[model samples]
Target: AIKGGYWYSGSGLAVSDINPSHFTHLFCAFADLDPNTNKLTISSSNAAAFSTFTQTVRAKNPSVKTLLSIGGGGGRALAAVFANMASQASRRKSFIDSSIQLARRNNFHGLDLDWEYPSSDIDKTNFASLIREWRAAVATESSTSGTPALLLSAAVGGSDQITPLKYYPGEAIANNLDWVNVMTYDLYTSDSYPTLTQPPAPLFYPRGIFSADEGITKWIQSGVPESKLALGLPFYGFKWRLSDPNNHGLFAPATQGLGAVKYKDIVNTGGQVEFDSTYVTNYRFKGTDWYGYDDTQSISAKVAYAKQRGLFGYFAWHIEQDSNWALSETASRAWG
Candidate 1:
C-alpha cells in the first residue's frame, strides 16, 4: 500500500520475471551432473522446476519456447562425456537415442551445449560427430511425434583458446544448430601483480588485454555465421584494488556488472563512471577500489554492434545473478 494508497487483495511470488511477456525464447539453467551424487539426471531432477517455470511462461505466452543448458562452471566433465558418448559406434547410437528421450521427457523445445573450451583437433571431430548423431535421432523423432522441431545451440569461447583457429566447421555445425552464444566477458580477472602499471585505467580495456570488440570480431572472422551468433553480456563486473602495493587496482565480484550494484545502490554510493576508449565499457570508483563493468550505455553499443553485423541478438550469462533487474532490463531495451 506504499504506492499512493494502492492495496493488494491477494499476494503471490512474482512468476512473470523469467516469463517476461517480451521474450519468445527462454533458456533455463541446469546442473545435470551432481558432484555429490555423481549422477547425470538432467531430465529427472529438474522435472518439477521445469514444469513450474514453463507452465507460468506458457500461460502468459503459449508460443514461448524453452531449452535446457547442460554444463557450466565445474561441469567441464561434459566435454569428456560428450567424447565418450560418441567414442564408439554403439555408444554414439545410444547417446543420440537418449538425448531424444531426455528432450521429450523434460518438456523442453530443444538442447543447449555448454562445454567450456575444447581446442584440440580431436575435440573438433568428437563434437561434430556428437551433433550429427543427435540431429539425426531428433529428426527421426520429430517426424513421428509431430512436435515442433528442436532447437540446438552451444555456448562458445570468445578467445581462440583450445578450439582450432576457426572452430568445428561453421557450415557443418550450422546444419544442426539454431544459434551459438559466444561468451565475450571474463576476458581477464583480478590482477595478481601490483605496480607493474599505472592506475590501470579503471577498466582494463582502455589499455589492458582482450577488448570486447576484439572478441566479437575474432569470432565472426573465424567463420561463425554472424546471423546465428549471440553476443553474451555479463551481468556483473570485476573489482580491482587500487591502493595495493602491487597495485592490482581494487575490485571484486558483484551479482550484477559493476559489482552487481543496483541503480539505487549506484545513486546511494555516489559512484563515478569511468570509460575505456578501447573496449567501450564502463568503470566506476567508489572508494579506493576501481570496478570495471558494462552498464546500459556500453551494452547499448554492443547491441548496436550485433545489429550492425546482422547477428542474432544477445544472451545473458547466469541470469540469476541479476537481482536488481536493472542490467537485464537495460540490456534488453538495447537489444530491442
Candidate 2:
C-alpha cells in the first residue's frame, strides 16, 4: 500500500516548510532533460532545493521515500522531446543513464517520468523499448552499487481522458514500472466543458462518461495490475459563472469560466456546500458563481473508492495546494 504526495520545486514554499508526515512517498518535481543532449540536468532554478530535498523532508518523516520526477506537462514542444529521445537507442541511453545517476547523486530514492504524452505508433513502440532498457539499467546499477533497486514510476494521462492510452505501451508499463500514477484530475474543466458545471474529478458518474473508476477499469483491462496503480485526487477545482441561479446542477449552463480556483481560495471564501452522492463530488454556489471541487467528504469517499477498488493507493497532485492538511488528513483516515 502507498500514500503519495507531490511538491513542485518552484512552489517557493521552501524545502523545510513542507510536512511529509502524512505521506509514504513524496515526489520532487521536476528534473529536466536537455533537448539537445537528452541528458538529465536539474536546472539552476531547481538545483538549490533539489540538492537537499530528501535530507530536509526527513525531519517530518524519515521513512518517506522521495522521487526525482522528470518532465512536466509542457504541452506539444516538450512532448516531442521525450518522443525523440525515446525513439533511438543512443538517445534513450543518454536519458536513462543520466536520470538514474542524478537520482543517486541528489539522494532521491527513485525516478518518475511525467511526459505529457507519447501519441503515435512509433512513440508506442519506442516508449516500450525505452522502459524495458530503463528497468535493465536500474537492475545493473543496483547490483553494482550493492544498493536496493531504485523505484520507477510514471504519471500518465488517465486512460483516454486527456489523451488515448491505446498509444501507451501497457504491457511494458506493467512489467517495468513499480507503479503508475493515473492522473484522474483535470478530466473536465470549465474551459473544456464550458456549458455545464461538472465535477472536476468524480469517483462515479451517472453512466459511462470518464469518471475516475471508468478510467481505472480501462487500465486494468489493458493489463496493468491494480496493485501497481495509484488513483489521483485533485487539491484544486474550477469555477464558472452560472447562467441561471435556480438551475444549478451537473449540466446547467455557465456563462463564463474563471478557470482553476485553488482549494485554499475556496476555503477562504465560504459558500453553500453540498455533497452529491451519485457523482461522488462536491460543489459550492453562492449566487451565480458555481465552484466544483473535492472537500473532506468527497476526498474521504474517493479514498474509500480507491481502497474498495483494490488500488495500490491514492495521491494528490500538489500537496501545497491543500487547505492545511484537511483533505490530506481525511484521506489518511479514510484509507485506514
- The most accurate candidate by TM-score is 2
Q: For candidate 1, lDDT tens digit of each residue in 25-72?
A: 666665364333323356564566655665676887787677666666
**With candidate 1 superimposed using the best TM-score fit, by how many Å does residue 66's alpha carbon deviate from the native?**
1.1
Candidate topping lDDT: 2
lDDT of 2 by residue, 188-228 (tens): 78898888898888877665568787889988988899998
Model 1 ranges off by over 4 Å: 1-19, 31-40, 43-45, 75-78, 161-167, 191-209, 244-270
lDDT computed for candidate 2: 0.89
List clash counts for every candidate, in order: 21, 0
> What value of lDDT does candidate 1 attain over all alpha carbons?
0.57
My TM-score estimates for the predictions, one after another, are 0.78, 0.97
Worst lDDT window (10 residues) for model 2?
202-211
